[PDB]
Write a protein that binds this ligand. Structure first.
Ligand code: ZN
Ligand code: ZN
Ligand code: ZN
Ligand code: ZN
Ligand code: ZN
Ligand code: ZN
Ligand code: ZN
Ligand code: ZN
Ligand code: ZN
Ligand code: ZN
Lengths: 274, 274, 274, 274, 274
């Protein structure tokens, strides 16, 4: 059975702030080491639980964080950015399930290093339903009828996952105290947690269903300021909701909605004076 | 008659982006020159219209922008920051009226360089009523029973002013096209506009009333992310509205509410990972 | 009569290389001074020839080059970037004609500082017809039934203009020797040329017709490398022509085609390893 | 039994100056290594003495110093800043006792790297009683009826501790010679000292009582200069004692007094020209 | 009659913050221009009032601020640092009186840019009497039986002067609002004030007496932290008052006390971790 893995960084265990996730900062090298090892715990247990294939997609920033020379040798790594489907690149209907690792809470909510794709977004909406990276990626997984079996990260990401995906297995490797502070488990302790949770998730997979997205989903993105909204509103097919900093885009399907998100946020990232 | 002047920079005529208002950028020196001259037009007409005193308060960033060696010699300049009442420092009940120059639109709305005090705030609220710098400063002016006779800036700031202060005179020195683009009048052209508008404002002053604030106003600040809300929520007497990034503070009066704004935004400014 | 002006920098007289057009380089300040004065010659002659209104749109880079304090006082300046229609922002059907100043040759062809919007594009296509900034802007002018009366820049931009717009008046303020070298006229000499040419263009306006664009134009952009094509191909409604670095976009009208160009090139600008 | 641990850096053994505690300096990496190991000695002995839980709160600067990958695996680490209760975050009435590690002397007194929270404070006062970080944290511990069983650091911090908390156990890992010089014990030697002292502290716990704070404590902060006092005096409910650089704040309880300290010092930190 | 002038910068008119007095900051060049001109007003009036000689001593920082090429040609300028008597270098018993220009309030008290010699000192004491630069320089003037006829600076410096020197003439060129903010008079307005005040001071000189210092003055310096006290306590003849950050030095005369101040503060300036 093929298992898909999307690994982010903010939710990795032990990491309290961006000095561990920003490639240009002092604790980054330690961060990617811990990140790679955290993924190995899940990969190891994935194979040990019957999986014959495990696709690992680096889903953070430049997505060149996971160390290819230290990742589980029997796993296939997708490294690099500018991928057609970013965080869910390589995920198709041939996968038995998906596993989100090192995830964090969506923007504007409690949770360590909370945000959604870029600092500029406050909320993502798929037909009026509030979602973050977790939600959007789950919806893309749904498009391929692939269920999100497990989600690991801080306690807030776990809560956010289970409130969206029924019976989903969550692994809270750390507890959020503030947006830049957490109470975490020792690397070895989190390893057991992840090992057990991954095992249970794979055997309890039948109780989890794909997060089916609407046929012609309406993507809504609320940005922090009006400037970011103007930038995104440059993309054809978009419109700004008067009296707000929200930009909407009527998509043909979830896949088009995802890519519209990529482009709109990319444009918003160029906003100055903020 | 004593006239009070609060001069910001983003709304100054001819200025399209922050390269003209950020002391650390290439067009700053030209910006403060134009800013000082813009204020002189109003000061000159103020005296010409009978005013015996004109207090000019630099209300932008470090508030050391207006050039003391080029400002109207008969005017009194307040230069420097860390002032008890920031943008409205020096304003008391002994003034006949107030004049806001170089103002801009509040955060989250259309208007060149739109924002409210710091990049981190999305909305300011005084008893559920949406306001930005313009609103808050008007309310403090109201506390001293001083009416805001005139408000100058872009077309968006003007609109925002008149929708808050009945019969207020506005002078749109430039038209907003985007958050970093405008269609402006020549320096001399804006001068005439400001001269005429200032004259009319002073003679039509009887038709404008002070923006009286509530007795025990409730200050509400919605921040861009949860991290900024946590910082502000550190201040005694504050509370975060569950499910939001808004922090509230019950004040004794408008003056305490203003300072609470200064402190809460100052704290929010320290937020990292954004 | 209302006259629209789009002013770029590379084609301004006397400027041989990017040290005069890059805001971060040594000769930039002299460059924008010459640029502002060059525009004044045309503006002055525009009014002298009957025009009652002259809208000047800064169309270079951050578009904050023209100096508002030195531009003709009777002209209206659009300064700043992130404008819905970039180089042709503010142009509607109420204008008698358009005047392109300081223009340069399109990418991949002879001409000083030749390029099209960004360094990454090799060619722009509107229904298989090769065009650069000059062509695209002319087509947008055509959408509003406004004719391009005059085009000033180097000899190559002039040649490019006349091969696209019949009877158009051109003013070659300098001769191209290489992509970073030119034989130019003295500032005063170019002034006369521009003055005479602007006068003739306004009186010979009847002989020039709007460059009418197709109803549902197909925008094609050929990028320098495949990476830039992949970035642009992220935008919904786009497709890469197999075996090429060209991305196509079927637009509803010229206006949508223009904005699609803005977004696609903006995305391409992010391409690394080039 | 649950044991709470607050670990600072200046008082850590072997560390003579700030090159070992400032994340931006040459000896920082060695410093945090020694710091983590120093904490492990206490944690190990804590468990060995019966404790079932040990909460470790990084209480220095950005509080991301203790190394999660090297800390005792059976301990729970709180890493990160912007915590509601900074140095005493996570401390409640469910703890048997508290242990302060790597502490230093309060500002304005003898002791290596002496200070109180920020360089700008000279003295902290809780109802006229002189206290520093040690005192304030003890008082917050008192609010939860939790006694400070042990305090480790230099000889000056130890003396300061015992003069405030009767029968408290102190461990002087180093002797102060100057504010940036000390006579220290070898890493292994300090380890034994800490091991023995921690054991004795836990078994002699009955002789130590919580430092009960006043019901409505009055916080007083004397700053180095008047500028820092003005900044803090911006916070609602504060007042400057005429003729001094001291700012007072009447709190509802010790918890509000602590946060008022956090905010007032945070504001004072912004003071320029010092 | 010979007149002595000591010119500092913080108290100069129009200057709100250190960006105007720190040679390494953006507004310094404007600052020293205003400073030189401010001194010229007094020099001009000094000569116009009968004075035959005017010695001008640059008394700020590196003391190379006053511009020799723009200072009154008939005045003698002392430029440079490391002078035996710093701020009062060149002052002897052959002078009719002294004039302090651009002075500021002493450390730890209200007043724009308040401090005493270095940021590290909180208070200076001459036989238990609180004094700052103003006081110490007046005492040195007293040693030579020279009276301080006039003192110019902000309102706080003026107040401090008159509370120390009976009948002294003060000129408040600006009003203090905060340590980095003031309400100032136009350069020309301050000029008249200084001109009038200088004239009155010279003709009312008989009513002012020299601030005679004790025979064997005891210098006391209270520093911000203990580290600065330790540094100064290195100088032979010094002692730290237990329980404080104050260092005392028994001098033979006011001249020795002054130089002891120079050395003690110079040593304190080396203090790290502050
Ligand atoms: Zn993420
Ligand atoms: Zn991430
Ligand atoms: Zn503003
Ligand atoms: Zn501003
Ligand atoms: Zn161009
Ligand atoms: Zn250009
Ligand atoms: Zn400490
Ligand atoms: Zn510390
Ligand atoms: Zn001084
Ligand atoms: Zn000075």
């Amino acid at each position: 059975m093929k298992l898909y893995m999307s690994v982010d960084m903010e939710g990795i265990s032990g990491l309290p702030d961006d000095t561990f996730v920003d490639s240009g900062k002092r604790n980054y090298e330690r961060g990617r080491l811990i990140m790679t090892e955290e993924a190995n715990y899940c990969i190891a247990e994935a194979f040990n639980s019957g999986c014959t294939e495990v696709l690992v997609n680096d889903s953070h920033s430049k997505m060149n964080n996971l160390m290819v020379e230290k990742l589980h040798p029997e796993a296939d790594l997708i490294s690099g950015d500018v991928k057609p489907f970013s965080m869910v690149e390589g995920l198709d209907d041939t996968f038995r399930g998906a596993l989100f690792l090192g995830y964090h809470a969506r923007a504007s909510t409690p949770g360590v290093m909370s945000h959604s794709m870029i600092f500029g977004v406050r909320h993502f909406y798929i037909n009026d339903r509030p979602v973050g990276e977790l939600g959007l990626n789950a919806y893309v997984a749904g498009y391929y009828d692939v269920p999100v079996l497990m989600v690991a990260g801080d306690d807030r990401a776990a809560k956010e996952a289970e409130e969206l995906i029924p019976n989903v297995t969550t692994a809270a490797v750390k507890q959020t105290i503030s947006r830049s502070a957490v109470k975490c488990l020792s690397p070895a302790k989190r390893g057991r947690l992840l090992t057990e949770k991954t095992a249970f998730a794979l055997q309890n997979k039948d109780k989890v269903k794909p997060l089916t997205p609407p046929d012609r989903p309406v993507l809504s993105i609320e940005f922090a300021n009006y400037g970011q909204a103007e930038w995104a509103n440059l993309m054809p097919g978009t419109e700004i909701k008067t009296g707000t900093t929200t930009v909407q885009f009527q998509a043909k399907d979830m896949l088009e909605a995802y890519q519209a998100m990529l482009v709109m946020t990319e444009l918003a990232m160029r906003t100055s004076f903020c």
